[PDB]
Amino acid sequence: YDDGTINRERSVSRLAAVAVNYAKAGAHCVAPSDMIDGRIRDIKRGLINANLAHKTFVLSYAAKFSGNLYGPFRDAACSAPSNGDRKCYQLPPAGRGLARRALERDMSEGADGIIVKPSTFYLDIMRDASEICKDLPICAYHVSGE
Amino acid sequence: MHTAEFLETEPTEISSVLAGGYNHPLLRQWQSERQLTKNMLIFPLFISDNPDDFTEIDSLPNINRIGVNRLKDYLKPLVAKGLRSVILFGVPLIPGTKDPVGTAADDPAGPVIQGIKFIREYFPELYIICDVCLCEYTSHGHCGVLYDDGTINRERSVSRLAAVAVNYAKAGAHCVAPSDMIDGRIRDIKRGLINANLAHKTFVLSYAAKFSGNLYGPFRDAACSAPSNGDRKCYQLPPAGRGLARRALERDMSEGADGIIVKPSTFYLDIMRDASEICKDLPICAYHVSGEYAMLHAAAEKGVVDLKTIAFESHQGFLRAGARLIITYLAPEFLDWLDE
Amino acid sequence: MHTAEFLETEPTEISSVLAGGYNHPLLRQWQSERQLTKNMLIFPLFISDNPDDFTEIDSLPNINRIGVNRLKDYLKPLVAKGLRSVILFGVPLIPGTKDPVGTAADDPAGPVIQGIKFIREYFPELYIICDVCLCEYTSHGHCGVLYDDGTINRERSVSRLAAVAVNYAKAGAHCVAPSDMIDGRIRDIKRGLINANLAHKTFVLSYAAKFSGNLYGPFRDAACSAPSNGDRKCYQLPPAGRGLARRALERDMSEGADGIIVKPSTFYLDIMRDASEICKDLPICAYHVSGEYAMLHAAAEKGVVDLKTIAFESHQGFLRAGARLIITYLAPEFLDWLDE
Amino acid sequence: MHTAEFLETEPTEISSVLAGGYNHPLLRQWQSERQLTKNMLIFPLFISDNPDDFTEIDSLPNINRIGVNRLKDYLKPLVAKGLRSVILFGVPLIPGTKDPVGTAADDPAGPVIQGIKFIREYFPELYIICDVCLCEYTSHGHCGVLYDDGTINRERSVSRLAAVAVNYAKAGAHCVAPSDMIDGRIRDIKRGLINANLAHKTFVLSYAAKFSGNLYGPFRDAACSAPSNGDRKCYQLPPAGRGLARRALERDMSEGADGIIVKPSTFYLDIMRDASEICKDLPICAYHVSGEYAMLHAAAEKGVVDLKTIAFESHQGFLRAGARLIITYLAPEFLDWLDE
Ligand SMILES: *[C@H](CCC(=O)O)CC[C@H](*)CCC(=O)O
Ligand SMILES: *[C@H](CCC(=O)O)CC[C@H](*)CCC(=O)O
Ligand SMILES: *[C@H](CCC(=O)O)CC[C@H](*)CCC(=O)O
Numbered sequence A: 001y002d003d004g005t006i007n008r009e010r011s012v013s014r015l016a017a018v019a020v021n022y023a024k025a026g027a028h029c030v031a032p033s034d035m036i037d038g039r040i041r042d043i044k045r046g047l048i049n050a051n052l053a054h055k056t057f058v059l060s061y062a063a064k065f066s067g068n069l070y071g072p073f074r075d076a077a078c079s080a081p082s083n084g085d086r087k088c089y090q091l092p093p094a095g096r097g098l099a100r101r102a103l104e105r106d107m108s109e110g111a112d113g114i115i116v117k118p119s120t121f122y123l124d125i126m127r128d129a130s131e132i133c134k135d136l137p138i139c140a141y142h143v144s145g146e
Numbered sequence B, C, D: 001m002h003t004a005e006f007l008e009t010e011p012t013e014i015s016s017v018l019a020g021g022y023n024h025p026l027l028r029q030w031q032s033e034r035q036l037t038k039n040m041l042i043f044p045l046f047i048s049d050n051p052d053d054f055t056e057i058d059s060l061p062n063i064n065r066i067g068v069n070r071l072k073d074y075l076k077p078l079v080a081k082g083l084r085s086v087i088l089f090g091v092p093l094i095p096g097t098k099d100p101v102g103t104a105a106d107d108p109a110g111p112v113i114q115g116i117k118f119i120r121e122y123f124p125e126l127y128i129i130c131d132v133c134l135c136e137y138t139s140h141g142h143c144g145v146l147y148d149d150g151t152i153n154r155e156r157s158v159s160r161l162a163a164v165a166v167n168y169a170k171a172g173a174h175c176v177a178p179s180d181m182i183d184g185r186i187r188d189i190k191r192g193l194i195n196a197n198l199a200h201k202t203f204v205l206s207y208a209a210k211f212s213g214n215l216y217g218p219f220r221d222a223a224c225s226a227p228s229n230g231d232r233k234c235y236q237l238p239p240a241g242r243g244l245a246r247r248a249l250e251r252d253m254s255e256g257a258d259g260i261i262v263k264p265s266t267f268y269l270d271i272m273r274d275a276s277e278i279c280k281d282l283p284i285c286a287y288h289v290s291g292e293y294a295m296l297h298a299a300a301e302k303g304v305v306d307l308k309t310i311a312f313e314s315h316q317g318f319l320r321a322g323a324r325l326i327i328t329y330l331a332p333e334f335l336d337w338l339d340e
């Protein structure tokens, strides 16, 4: 938005296109790492409309936490925010209840698998995920900081 | 021209929308199942049998071997800043003291019982926890009494351990924390306290889920307790052993534990979560071990993380995972930090 | 003309769409709750009291009666290929050896204890499991000691069984697996190991859910253990007995089992699933029995199935159902197969 | 002398004692969660478009391709013996009939709809189930309509499938059983029946948990439906896919299934158990597939098992695992067997 806050609808519209476009290019799996509300639904609908949903694994970063452990990644992918931080979309580290809800949401919206990130420092969320998302593959992201 | 494609999407579902819950720093606080307070912190002390000792270990700030004449200067400002509890470890450095059955463990002239009397005298409001084990006191460095083949003698070990724990309580410890991981030791320590008319006064804080691993290096240097031959893999739990941890938690609660410790902490947060279910009616305590503590210092010096920042992240993680208490070498820092 | 009718349908619901999860062979691997590794495999050995024995049974490749001087040539390439564990069954063929109380079961000159010493000597890294029962050693062929009326004497049986199991452990077995299904035998074997100062060294792997049925034919031929009069229906569980299986699982865990075996396997996969809940904190082991093994060979020769293919399908099914270990006569094949 | 050692043991614990529950053959019946009755049995029929056909397949007794003028002689004694239900599969052998969209699937002159009318006329008490899929009717042998790249076209497939299922119901089938495993097909078939004013008359029995594997050989020979290019691994579930099975079960129930089929049976008994929880309010049906059926025959000819005996063991296992219905090629045998 002009105020520097995230535009949900515009964002998920853009994100869904990028994900379809990668699949169209030949990616087997898309892993949305944006943490923007409802993006998995729009990406799944996008793949369905593209006749690609039966070919494309959606691996959501459903439980993705804000924190101090992404330093080196940011250096390698040169993606640091210019103004401010990710605290209003990445989950707050103490936010267990929000993680649990984000896990239920992303599975409900079409995720075939889920990523918990960071890993070691969020092992309890992995355990929470292993219950909520028991019928789905869970993937741990050992982040650059870890 | 490659241009920015935007897909046509449907109206927002209310079920998708989480953002209203954490858009402001006060809400990110509100989202915690429990807040970090000063009285949750337990600080380990290593007492030397040299009363004038103040030896720094591995260049870490909050791991020193301290003798009793040095304890009052050291604790005064800590207690000043709201420190509520300590966990004592003994380091008898005098030669000929260690033997195969850990005789010095409950030596009334030993640093643990000397420290207990010092602290009950000079800091009567401090809550005293003593570690209960034999590894700091056996010549072989193992947590129990051994068979001739070097394996652990269960019955002989728990018999010895139960005496040490009663003897600390008799000396004035408020809490005993058996760290030996020897099968059934909590039952024998509880029965021991009951027979001593001390069970109604003594909190038993079991190290119920205590894992073998690579994270105890610095501790071993400070308490000089490394095993002499082999390792702890047949009594400390194997890191992949979730099922064994769950059973050890049910066991220790059944045998009388008033509280449980999960150790190490960060690397075993999922066991904390498992403990928060099995042991839901008991206090859970996280032990931020010396390896975890020095790992954060190492990372912060190399510029990978910010020490205060990752310290808060790690310690909030304990609370997120179910712990309501924390043993940590960073207690002096948090007694300042939680002020601001 | 009859033409192809197509109904008008609504847009796809996201909830309907599962296909994104298994459209590629790596994903069909990802979908497994656990993968098949070499160290999960346990291979049965039938040791003969004739030290030069190498007798093939029922024309099956991986059921031979083998004497001790023949064991090293036989195990060497198996261990070569990563075999980690064996389960010993004794077959005393010398006349006058069998009697009504199974005296030869723990004969130090018997093939089980001879095999244990051979293997601890020549293959010190192999994990040794011994079957614990009397059927291979009684003249009447029953798993326990009998009353004069031919029915099982519980107390006399478990007393005998507990000694055999301690005696195998004393000889060097790492694990005992009581297959007798006689009420309360695990309690008595555990107490026996405890009294022998061996319980901290010996894994008790109970055949807790062991069913009577039609699938043990070939085994009986190889271990020569068929009952002489009647059958096992009053101690082995009745195939329809789900409630009794569930109770036998709770019982054996309560009495000290460190692990449990469900047997047979394929035909009792639902009991494996039941076990994975009741015994969630313990290793579950599937026994692919001789009847199940020869059934697959029979089917594959008649062209109904592909042996390697249905072998992988059946053994993945064990893991799907909750097992993390497998006793199987197809272990030599999987030690090659899991390479490719 | 080696003598028979007996350990000293404690008095029997009541908790150990299970034997009082199954010491008599009537009690071993009592222990079943449900008994095997005739009306639980569903027998598959393969109808040929040659009305005088009676072709035996793979030398198995209860897999024949039968034409309609031969059906009354064949069903009469079966129905005589209490057969309550049949599941129809069509085998159009006339050339030029198969095409890429399965047009002949609902051909009113086709063997399924001819068989439905024959049976409603001549056996008005028989409960008729028809398999709903396109594999027996497509030139390419796949269960759905394909994209030019040979992959399944979901929307086109479920549109076609829903019509076939309505058309069978319109013809007089009491039940449709979609075996296609194509995402969301049950929703579209249910909506189709609703729009046809037939949903209150038609049981939808989904093959919800239907696995890819090695056990469909003989069926493929009898219904001549083998895929021409490749296999069914991207729509049939992968054998290790427990999580996908559980989700497919929840999905199909949510989309309108009145009952569910788990297939194959013996090799997927744990999924039956999973289904008995998820789908506890619905009938569960086990499909003893042609591969499983011929495997038992193969084993019984080689002398590994007794056919009647392992047949009862396997079919009781279905019921033990949660099934209250069974599709089985052994129905003619059980209609005699359950008499004695
Ligand atoms: C998530 C966003 C990361 C971030 O920089 O906020 C996608 C990549 C995560 C890996 C991070 C790492 O390896 O540190
Ligand atoms: C448990 C035994 C530790 C060991 O060295 O095995 C009691 C003390 C644990 C704290 C260890 C640490 O701070 O690293
Ligand atoms: C259990 C008793 C078997 C029996 O013959 O009753 C111990 C061995 C089981 C393996 C049986 C097999 O492989 O068929």
Ligand SMILES: *[C@H](CCC(=O)O)CC[C@H](*)CCC(=O)O
Residues within 6 Å of the ligand: D131, D179, D215, D216, D217, D218, D219, D220, D225, D232, D263, D287, D288, D289, D290, D291
């Ligand atoms: C499901 C599809 C079977 C297949 O050939 O893929 C419908 C019929 C199942 C019965 C198969 C059998 O009896 O082997």
Ligand SMILES: [Zn+2]
Residues within 6 Å of the ligand: B133, B134, B135, B136, B142, B143, B179, B180
């Ligand atoms: Zn210790």
Ligand SMILES: [Zn+2]
Residues within 6 Å of the ligand: C133, C134, C135, C136, C142, C143, C179, C180
């Ligand atoms: Zn036996």
Ligand SMILES: [Zn+2]
Residues within 6 Å of the ligand: D133, D134, D135, D136, D142, D143, D179, D180
């Ligand atoms: Zn089909």
